């Protein structure tokens, strides 16, 4: 007989169109929103049709205009005030309220407030602790480096002055970047010492000014960081991919299960492009990723959550960890793993949360795809990197993107494509991951040509649009 699982419903990791439907089939759902801005009218409607209960955070309707929900969001542009206790109290009341058996969320930004709620009822969860360690990135790399995975030097930094120590102990280059966001948000790359003061007090003005909810704390709001370098060639036969995979995993009752490691095609910046479902590493490579994971994972002392781990593959095929989330991966990677092998995650991971172990949990990667699928974006770069648009274009409007005929190798093809609406309008001032502009899929027996197809693409695509510029 079915159990109640409690999902905060925001942005972010298992996307809605396959993460409500997947969990209906055996739960019945009560949704909490503590932020009904961060809900799109077509993730609404899902929330709705598969939710026993729903139940938004009151406190932000103040008249008519509030109830409109927008077409698209990416990152949710408005204030959430709650001190993280009172987020904590209001996911324990709506369980008590609705006799919650699990509770999960795809969104990044409420992971350690969900832990807390989560053990405070006795159910399963990332645990208290080790969900900050996933969420703060100085907590982070410190339990990385303590675990037994490739470690790098490391400083907290808040002031200027923090900024200048890091500086010196660690040298250029030296990766600065938030502890306590997502999507590569002001994470910056320092490659000389003449200009890096400058870098600082820009990122540090640009941080104060991005939405982010009163429940996410730090311990500082940067971390000064070693960059992880690269080695594409101890690692992939062909060209296509890039520096770097993410792998999605499991931990039940603190055992780390790994699924699906995911190839990448070079980023724009930190920029994400796409994702191929499933990696085309030998088996060699993919023990010494899962190696890597596994000893992080169960380094942060995660206990029971999705696995979003991202590793740069560096010299001597040495795994260096990136980050890692005790949630889903983001775009649809948990779908094109659910396409590919026929296993759901999101019902896999609700299974844990409800009965541990006794889930259907694979041992060791799956195996055997029957082929490749690949999720793509385009961006406003692509198009000033193919000389579409100039570099000083102020204000995009988009009415198509076209995919001429001839770009595809082998048997790749084309599941699926879709453009920003006709007449939409995008800031080129905006940070490049928020400015997305076409979605893709991409389909086939080969992953080498799947990845040309990408570049392709991405080199070809025709934009029909109008810009502005100044005299
Ligand atoms: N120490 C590092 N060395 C090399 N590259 C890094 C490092 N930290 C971050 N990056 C790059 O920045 C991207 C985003 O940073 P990340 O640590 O994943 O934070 P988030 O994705 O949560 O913003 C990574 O995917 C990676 O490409
Ligand atoms: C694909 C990326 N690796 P991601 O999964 C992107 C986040 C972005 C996100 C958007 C809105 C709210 C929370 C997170 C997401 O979609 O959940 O994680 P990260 O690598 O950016 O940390
Ligand atoms: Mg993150
Ligand atoms: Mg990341």
């Known amino acids: 007989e079915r159990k109640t699982v409690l999902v905060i419903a925001d942005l972010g990791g298992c996307p809605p169109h396959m993460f409500y439907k997947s969990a209906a089939e055996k739960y019945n759902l009560v949704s909490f929103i503590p932020r009904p801005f961060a809900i799109t009218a077509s993730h ?10 729903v139940i938004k955070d009151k406190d932000y309707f103040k008249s008519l205009a509030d109830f409109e929900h927008p077409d698209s969001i990416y990152w949710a542009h408005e204030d959430h005030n709650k001190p993280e206790e009172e987020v904590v109290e209001q996911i324990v009341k709506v369980a008590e309220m609705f006799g919650a058996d699990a509770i999960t969320t795809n969104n990044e930004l409420f992971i350690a407030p969900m832990a807390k709620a989560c053990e405070r009822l006795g159910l399963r969860g990332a645990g208290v602790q080790a969900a900050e360690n996933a969420r703060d990135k100085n907590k982070m790399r410190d339990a990385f480096n303590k675990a037994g995975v490739k470690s790098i030097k490391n400083k907290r930094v808040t002031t200027l002055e923090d900024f200048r120590a890091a500086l010196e102990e660690i040298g ?7 502890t306590y966001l997502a999507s590569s948000i002001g994470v910056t790359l320092i490659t000389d010492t003449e200009t890096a003061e400058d870098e600082f007090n820009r990122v540090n003005d640009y941080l104060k000014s991005i939405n982010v909810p009163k429940a996410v704390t730090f311990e500082a709001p940067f971390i000064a960081e070693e960059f992880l370098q690269g080695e594409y060639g101890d690692w992939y036969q062909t060209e296509g991919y890039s520096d770097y995979i993410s792998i999605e995993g499991i931990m039940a009752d603190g055992e780390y299960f ?29 023990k010494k990723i899962v190696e890597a994971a ?22 001597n095929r040495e795994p ?5 989330a005790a949630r889903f991966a ?118 080498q040509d799947v990845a040309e197809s990408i570049r392709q693409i991405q080199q070809h695509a025709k934009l029909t649009a109008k810009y502005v510029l100044p005299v």
Do not use: R
């Open 320 to 324: 260096g960890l990136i980050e890692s």
């Open 44 to 53: 609404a409607a899902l929330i709705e049709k598969y939710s026993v209960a």
């Open 330 to 447: 983001g775009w649809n990677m948990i779908p094109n793993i659910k396409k590919v092998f026929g296993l759901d995650m999101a019902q896999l991971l609700l299974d844990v949360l409800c009965f541990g172990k006794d889930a259907d949990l694979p041992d060791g990667l799956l195996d055997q795809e029957p082929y490749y699928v690949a999720d793509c974006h385009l961006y406003p770069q692509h198009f000033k990197q193919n000389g579409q648009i100039p570099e000083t274009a102020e204000d995009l409007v988009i009415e198509a993107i076209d995919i001429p005929d001839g770009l595809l190798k082998g048997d790749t093809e084309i599941v699926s494509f879709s453009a920003a609406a006709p007449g939409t309008s995008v800031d080129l001032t905006l940070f490049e991951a928020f400015n997305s502009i076409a979605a893709f899929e991409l389909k086939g027996s080969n992953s």
């Open 294 to 315: 596994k000893k992080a994972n169960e380094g942060l002392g995660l206990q029971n959550c999705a696995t979003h781990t991202e590793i740069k593959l560096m010299k």
């Open 172 to 178: 250029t280059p030296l990766i600065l970047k938030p």
């Open 258 to 286: 790994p699924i699906a490691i995911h190839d990448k095609t070079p980023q724009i910046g930190f920029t994400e492009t796409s994702h191929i479902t499933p990696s085309i590493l030998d088996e060699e490579a993919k």
